[PDB]
Assembly symmetry: C4
Homo-oligomer: 219 residues x 4
């Protein structure tokens, strides 16, 4: 010691205190959606946000002292740091995206409850086996997006004028969402063979993903 | 008479008789849909229904004396109870919801044929493992629906004006329903970076889905 | 009558001739589709048509002599039988539709090639173990069509005006097809609570589907 | 050095070198999609391209003499060959589709990298397994397309006027893309029974599809 409190924080009671708080501020932020609540009780709720934001700043500080540099190879906490930090840049300041960003803290419920922690851990763990198929596909999107841009962006700029648009569109087509009547039929009014681009494209991205799911499943 | 009654409820004719009426009522309920048919034979049917509802009412009565508490620890029968119960209440009474809700008694055909009861049970048995993946997704939806209401509810109130609306819109998107031409493209015209909310959202939401099944298959 | 003919049927000439003809009649049926070809060669192919069915009908008779009672408890032979008898339907205008049912004769390619029959039969083989589920749906879809026609057919006759219409509409939403912006958002404009029919309906119809496949998986 | 040239090629510096040129070109070709960029670097990169093909041209020539008959029985190099050949047409010729086909050379990143090769080589190997199914499906699409064209093309020529269109359309219905409100329901205004073609059509293409994957799964 070193630790004078170290045993707290480690303590079961204290964390669930954070967990009990998180679900509260999470409840607050929900109610903060109602314009009616914010005219009638906005005041109870702004300070409340700050108590919780203070306590959290506190709790994070405490946790770093105990763990010294070893807290910063814990992703969950790294997450807890940046997510609480996020909630600390001011509300009516510069960039209201940051105003919304502070709701990300509600994912701390995952961070503080090992079971969600366990789930998130399970899902990310299938990612490393996939990066190869993720690598091929991204290359393909990159190549076809380019072809689509050069083949169709002059007469159809909304969908294909810029590389990014071809990416966004191809993704849509990839998601198969309103792809015939929505994208290809029109295209085909001007360029009758455009199905020769799109129909194969649809085949490949669909074939691969399917087999991708099989490889996960086959133990 | 305890044994005398018990010997009645268990006969293969009682089961077949109630089942046959179920097959019959279900047919009438189908018949009840034609307003031509109603005009001509409507009266035949409004009464057959209550005749059937009574015979069914008796069956429930008979089965409870025999089983006492063992009738009410059986999930299938409780449902049977609650389904005939709801079929008890009158059309004029309250509002015309129960009047439709009554069609749920056709779920007795599942209730009464042992082959189907097995299928349902097999099916339901898949559910309990999911409560972990179920819960996580629910938190994710809650958080994101909140970010969505604050970001998009002023200019797109119908889709996102409300927590609920943001929930609805999101599931629709989750189902990938006309999500692209229908929602994100419009959003992007006011808020050009809206693809930065939905594309990731779609990823999380589709990946977790895969894994819900993989874990089902693998487990 | 057995001995004379039998020597023709099991031979490689008989089987190869019929099959290669299938491919010929299939090539020939593509062209009938272009009115340009039909105004310039229609008379050639309407009778080329006439000869294959002639060749197929005769072929059916022989195979029946040679196989006797064993012909009509063989499904593939039975199919060709049915698929040919149909192709025997009048050329002239008894009435128009059955005329289109003739292209089914291209399914003789399935019957007559052993690799495809393996596939088809393998496929059909999956059906019996699924049927208990199936029935479940048809009870489920039915209960709901009844509910749907009573709830929505008044203000929305096109989609829910008839039991049969509601079934259709209901099949559509299961396939998840333009289901929200297309169907249920409008419903909600009059009946704000329609999501209580369709969001559950969707979980259920989807739950069953996934689980149908896993049942395929274990088997 | 008709023979001995092999030791220069095949070197670890060699293979990796061609990869670095692919990545630059892959980057510079993305830049070719931009109209702004082409203004102040077009000639710099118009210059860049042909050098790469040339080098590639040089690299393909060297590798052939080293491998002789074997080079042209290497699947990855044949691609290399032809995707280089495409790039070898002149810049300002008659068919501007070829110019666009140039970016196909970014796929050499697949043939030149065994891990890329590993996924692609693995994926294709699945194909021979489905060829019995693919022939089946293509036979099935062909049959229903014929039927569609004779059935709906006169009143709906845009969608069914011709075989190809019916193919496209049928392919569309099969991705279930806007099929109902988009394709079938309109049909039904004129041909009330069209769901009888399409709902069965849907079951079948979905049935074969799902089961195809399960076979992939078990194997
Ligand atoms: C925060 C709880 O979720 C909701 O706010 C909603 C309810 C609350 O009931 C929840 C019923 N639940 C079991 C599906 N109905 C469901 C169903 C919705 C939803 O988005 O479904 C996922 C929304 C809603 C949708 C459409 C119009 C208004 C509103 Br309010
Ligand atoms: C036929 C697609 O239906 C699905 O439910 C699947 C989704 C989509 O379901 C969730 C809702 N969705 C439309 C986003 N992801 C894709 C990619 C799948 C596929 O392999 O077919 C292309 C299947 C699937 C998911 C999980 C486990 C096994 C399978 Br088979
Ligand atoms: Ca759509
Ligand atoms: Ca859709």
């Amino acid at each position: 010691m070193y630790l004078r409190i170290t045993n707290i924080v480690e303590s079961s009671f204290f964390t669930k205190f954070i967990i009990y708080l998180i679900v509260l501020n999470g409840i607050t932020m929900g109610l903060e959606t109602s314009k009616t609540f914010m005219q009638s009780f906005g005041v109870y709720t702004t300070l409340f946000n700050q108590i919780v934001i203070t306590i959290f700043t506190i709790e994070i500080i405490l946790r770093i002292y105990v763990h010294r540099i070893s807290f910063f190879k814990d992703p969950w906490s790294l997450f807890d740091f940046f997510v609480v930090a996020i909630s600390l840049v001011p509300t009516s300041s510069g960039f209201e995206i940051l105003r919304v960003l502070r709701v990300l803290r509600l994912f701390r419920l995952v961070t503080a409850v090992p079971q969600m922690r366990k789930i998130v851990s399970a899902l990310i763990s299938v990612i490393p086996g996939m990066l190869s198929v993720i690598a091929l596909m991204t290359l393909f999107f990159y190549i076809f997006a380019i072809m689509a841009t050069q083949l169709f962006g002059e007469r159809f700029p909304e969908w294909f004028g810029t590389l990014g648009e071809s990416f966004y569109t191809l993704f849509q087509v990839m998601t198969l969402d309103d792809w015939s009547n929505g994208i290809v039929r029109p295209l085909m009014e001007v360029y009758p063979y455009a199905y020769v681009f799109f129909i194969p494209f649809i085949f490949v991205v669909t074939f691969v993903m399917i087999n991708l799911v099989v490889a996960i499943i086959v133990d």
